[PDB]
């Protein structure tokens, strides 16, 4: 007569109807095909978990006390060293690392409620690597180290770059190459509204908005240079970020 749990990270947790002379409650899982089981002295489903793998390697279900997070870990055989690490949390983003031989991350996906994603690869042990955002409808390119992640987008003699610091958070900036005062951008960054907005020839040309959606979208000024124009067209594809570049 188990209860079934549901559980952040898509998983199901099935704990005991009552508790045993240790005042324990049984929790059991499958996990994938693995079954994995532990006990508890809570009556919630949260608790510790454990099985292994069809090739020995050990793995670890932690469900936290209020339910809110569940952490997903894959050990070696001996249980020392791990191998991999997924936690989902109580927005139900979520993050993934693998592991090298010494413990060291070398991969962390993060994957935020809305579905879009950072995937930091080679990752070394100074904490620098490759980075990649990946939003709905293309990615944006770049690196990775331990003061920042930096995105990159070239068009012409222009380059953005969107900057994530390691504390989250965002600023853009732009450098064109070009010499000429009549065709040369520039930008400025405003952090309150999360807004680039491009000059040419000392008039404003257009707003770039980083929205806390994880989109970009696009809003061109009038010709006078200082009234906005229409409405703001939401990018879809690289393409039309490049666009905005020239």
């Known amino acids: 007569n188990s209860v079934s749990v549901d559980l952040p990270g898509s998983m199901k947790v099935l704990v005991s109807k009552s ?27 949260s608790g510790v978990l454990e ?17 809110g997070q569940t952490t997903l870990e894959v050990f070696k055989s ?19 690392e693998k592991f090298n031989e010494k413990g060291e991350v070398s991969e962390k996906i993060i ?5 879009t994603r950072l995937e930091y690869t080679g990752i070394k042990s100074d904490g620098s690597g490759k980075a990649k955002e990946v939003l709905k409808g293309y990615v944006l390119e ?24 390691k504390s989250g958070a ?14 040369k951008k520039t930008a400025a960054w405003n952090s309150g509204t999360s807004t680039l907005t491009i000059t040419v020839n000392s008039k404003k040309t257009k707003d770039l908005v980083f929205t806390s959606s994880n989109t970009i979208t696009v809003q061109q000024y009038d010709s006078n240079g200082t009234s906005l124009e229409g409405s703001a067209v939401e990018i879809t594809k690289l393409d039309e970020i490049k666009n905005a570049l020239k």
């Open 78 to 96: 001996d249980g020392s060293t791990l191998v991999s690490k997924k936690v989902t949390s109580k927005d139900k983003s979520s993050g993934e």
């Open 51 to 67: 099985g292994v793998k069809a090739d020995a390697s050990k793995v670890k279900l932690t469900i936290s006390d209020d339910l």
């Open 142 to 165: 770049g690196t990775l180290t331990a003061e920042k992640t930096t995105l990159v987008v070239k068009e012409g003699t222009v380059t953005l770059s969107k900057n994530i610091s």
């Open 170 to 183: 965002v600023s853009v900036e732009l450098n064109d190459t070009d010499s000429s005062a009549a065709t």
């Open 111 to 115: 994957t935020r409620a809305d579905g």
């Open 19 to 45: 508790s045993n002379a240790d005042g324990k409650y049984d929790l059991i899982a499958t996990v994938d095909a693995l079954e994995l089981s532990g006990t508890s002295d809570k009556n919630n489903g």
